[PDB]
Amino acid sequence: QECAVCGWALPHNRMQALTSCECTICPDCFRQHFTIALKEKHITDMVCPACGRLLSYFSTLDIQLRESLEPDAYALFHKKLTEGVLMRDPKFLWCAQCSFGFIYEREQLEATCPQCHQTFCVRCKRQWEEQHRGRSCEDFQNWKRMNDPEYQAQGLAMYLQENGIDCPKCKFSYALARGGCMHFHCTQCRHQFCSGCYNAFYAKNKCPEPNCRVKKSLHGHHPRDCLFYLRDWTALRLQKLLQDNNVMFNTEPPGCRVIEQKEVPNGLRDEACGKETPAGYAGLCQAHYKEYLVSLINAHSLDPATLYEVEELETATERYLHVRPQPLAGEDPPAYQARLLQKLTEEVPLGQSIPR
Amino acid sequence: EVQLLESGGGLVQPGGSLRLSCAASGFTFRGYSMAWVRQAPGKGLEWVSTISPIGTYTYYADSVKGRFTISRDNSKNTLYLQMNSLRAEDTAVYYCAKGSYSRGTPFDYWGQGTLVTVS
Amino acid sequence: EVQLLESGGGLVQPGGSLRLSCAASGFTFRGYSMAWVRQAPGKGLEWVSTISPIGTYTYYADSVKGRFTISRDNSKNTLYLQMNSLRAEDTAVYYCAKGSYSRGTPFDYWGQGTLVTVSS
Ligand SMILES: */C(=C\C(=O)OCC(=O)NCCCNC(=O)O[C@@H]1CC/C=C/CCC1)CNC(=O)c1cc2c([nH]c1=O)CCCC2
Ligand SMILES: [Cl-]
Ligand SMILES: [Zn+2]
Ligand SMILES: [Zn+2]
Ligand SMILES: [Zn+2]
Ligand SMILES: [Zn+2]
Ligand SMILES: [Zn+2]
Ligand SMILES: [Zn+2]
Ligand SMILES: [Zn+2]
Ligand SMILES: [Zn+2]
Incomplete structure (x- = not known):
């Protein structure tokens, strides 16, 4: 001493x-x-x-x-x-778990903090485990994310929030789900748009689209494959479009747990949806499960017009081509349907800004 | 995205007790360590304490060890700092900090801070 | 005593570029790392980037990687921040910070921020 x-x-x-x-x-x-x-x-x-x-x-x-x-x-x-x-x-290293800074000039990828005596990767800064040896770092964190019980316990709710709502005007990203309400308001630039097709919601007398009959009302214009329209489809018809193209979809989970943002006096508080989760809906709302099915439809660019009847084709032609269709002499319902479906898919594309 | 909001500061007599809180949102609270830092009037920023992501390990500065107690409630995404036997040297703006896994910084986010005065 | 003065803020159109500077005094500039931090509306402080004392290492937050470039001129005790492809989310008060080597503090002093706003 x-x-x-x-x-x-x-x-x-x-x-x-x-x-x-x-x-x-x-x-x-x-x-x-x-x-x-x-x-x-x-x-x-x-x-x-x-x-x-x-x-x-x-x-x-x-x-x-x-x-x-x-x-x-x-x-x-x-x-x-x-x-x-x-x-x-x-090279000065910061230990993410005990905040101690120290010099590290060794060639090894795993560094041990001289303060808390824990080993971490020099590039990851995550705590080191033997499963990270020989594996890429992105593979390691995605392995911990794929093996976290609390992460997997939320189910498909995490998938809807990863599909962020990007405001097409200010490019702000919102890690939220669309749900049932399509009219989105950006707090950063006050722009009003649809969260499904990213088209603009026009105020009174502001819509420039021709042949529009609701110019004096707040509204938007959506392609035929937008969630604004496909939300009105049943869950059964939505997944038959998926089945007809060999696209898988969940019906069981692998109150609705999708996080929403409600207005509180102190800003915004995260609150789960909590709606009824019927059977066959992967443990989610009817609105959020349909959002999950529509995202799979949009990701693979499936055309809902392939299931249109004759009336649906006439509606789509008057809406997107602004021409009332009329059958030709010698046509049967299959020929009239085939003609309208071909001209619609040739002249009107799918959502040119839908997240895919 | 990330938001850290402090609360609980104010005027306290010497020897008094105070409890700070920090409401966290915009990230997975249980996946990061959290820390408290303070800046006394006219001085440099001083680290106070750090708590591990799930709370098994707690670290403290020498001047506050045993007097301050850090804790977290991952069920509510809230960080806490129990401060006992406060001295005049404890007068500072107390900042809530979120740990980071990005290179070159032990923390990537700090809060607005709350002012604590000891009479 | 440490003194940090920021400069270069202003109103910028989206996608535009801006260059911030910071005049430092009161300490050995060559002996410490420097950093930029920012305050978004209604937020505290977010780490932006950090440069090593002579510039060997440069670190960046993920949201600014590839868009921002930190640099320093030790000849004049000046820190720089070149900001390219500015987005509306980059609107914040940008603070100049003096680095530290003590545990729990990557910077011990930050100066009078300069405001950068991106129109929308
Ligand atoms: C439409 C929201 C909706 O459910 O419509 C119901 C209605 O008539 N009024 C809304 C009821 C209040 N709850 C709510 O969702 O508020 C949101 C965000 C908070 C305040 C901004 C304006 C009101 C809309 C679909 N849009 C949204 O869910 C949504 C969510 C956010 C934001 N804008 C939106 O339009 C911006 C901030 C993040 C969350
Ligand atoms: Cl580091
Ligand atoms: Zn001696
Ligand atoms: Zn000796
Ligand atoms: Zn450590
Ligand atoms: Zn790693
Ligand atoms: Zn916007
Ligand atoms: Zn739409
Ligand atoms: Zn219109
Ligand atoms: Zn729901």
Whole structure:
């Protein structure tokens, strides 16, 4: 319990425990030796003043030098370490779990914090496990996300929130689900648009589309494959369009848990949907399950017109082509349906801005 | 996205007790460690304490260890800081901090802060 | 005593570019890392980027990676932030910060921010 250079009798907890040589040096002589070694000697002369015993020594010594040295003496130690040993700045690591900063100049990918003594990846900063060895980092975090019970317990609700609502005017991203309400209001730029097709909701007398009969009312214009229209389809007919194109869809979970944002006095509070989750709807609302089916339809660019009857084709022609169709002489309902379906799919494309 | 809101600051007599809170949203609270930091008047920012993502490990600065107690409620995405036997040197703006896994910073988000004054 | 003065803020159209600067004094500029932090409307502080003392290492937040570029001129104790492809979400008060090596504090002082707003 004596200082190995001055002999001063101090408790062990009141001296500098030099990690490299395990001496016991009082704070005064610790300051004295390393300050003169930097201001008048070379950094290679920074051995222990008691005994006299590489870059992992400087990493452990940097911690003790930060505590006892002066701010300007500590800056001179970085300068000579940079200008004399490394030819560059030292790589300073922050431990994400204990917030301790330390120098790490080793070639290994896993670094151990000198404070909390936990191992983490130098690029990930996630806690290290043997499953990360030999695996890419993106593969590792996606492995922990695929094996988290609380993550998987939410089910398809996490899929609807990943499909973010991007405001087409200000490009702000909202990690939300569309649900049943299609009229979206952006708080950043006040733009009003549909969350399914990203088309504009026009105010009174602001719609420029020709042959529109609701110009004096707030409304938007949606393609035939928008959630605005396909929400009116039954869940059965929606998934038959998926089945007709060999697209899988959930009916069982792998109150509705989809997170919504309600208005509260102190901003916005996250609240689950909590609606009735019928059987065969993957444990979600009817509105959110239909949103889940429509996202699969839009991702594969499935055309709902392939299931249109004759009346539905006449409606789509008057809406998107602004021409009332009429059967030709010699046509039967199949020929009249085939003609309208062909001209509709040739002249009117699907959603040119629907998230796919 | 990320939002950290502090609460509980105010004027406290010396030797008094105070409890700060931090309401977190916009990220998975249970997946990151949280920390409290403070800045005394006219001084540099000083780290107070840090709690592990699920709460098994707690770290403290030497001047507040045993006097302050950090805790979190992942069920409610809330960080807490119980401060006992407050001294005049505890007067500072106390900031809630969210830990980060991005290179070059131990924290990527800080809150608005709450002012704590010790008479 | 540490002194940090920001400069370069203003009104920018979406997709535009802006260059912030920060004049530092009161400490050895070459001995510390420097960082930019910002305050979005109704928020606290969000880390933007950090540069090593001589510039060997540059770090960026994910939302600004590839769009922002941090740099420093130790000859004049000036920190820089080149911001390209500015979005409406980049609207914030941008603060100049002096780095620290102590645990729990990547920066110990930040200056009088300069406001950057992106029209929509
Ligand atoms: C339409 C929302 C809806 O359900 O319509 C019902 C209605 O008639 N009024 C809305 C009832 C209040 N609840 C609500 O969803 O408020 C939202 C956001 C909060 C305040 C902004 C304007 C009101 C709309 C579909 N749109 C949305 O759900 C939605 C969600 C957000 C935002 N805008 C929206 O239009 C912006 C902020 C994030 C959440
Ligand atoms: Cl780091
Ligand atoms: Zn001694
Ligand atoms: Zn020795
Ligand atoms: Zn650690
Ligand atoms: Zn990794
Ligand atoms: Zn917008
Ligand atoms: Zn639409
Ligand atoms: Zn119209
Ligand atoms: Zn629902």
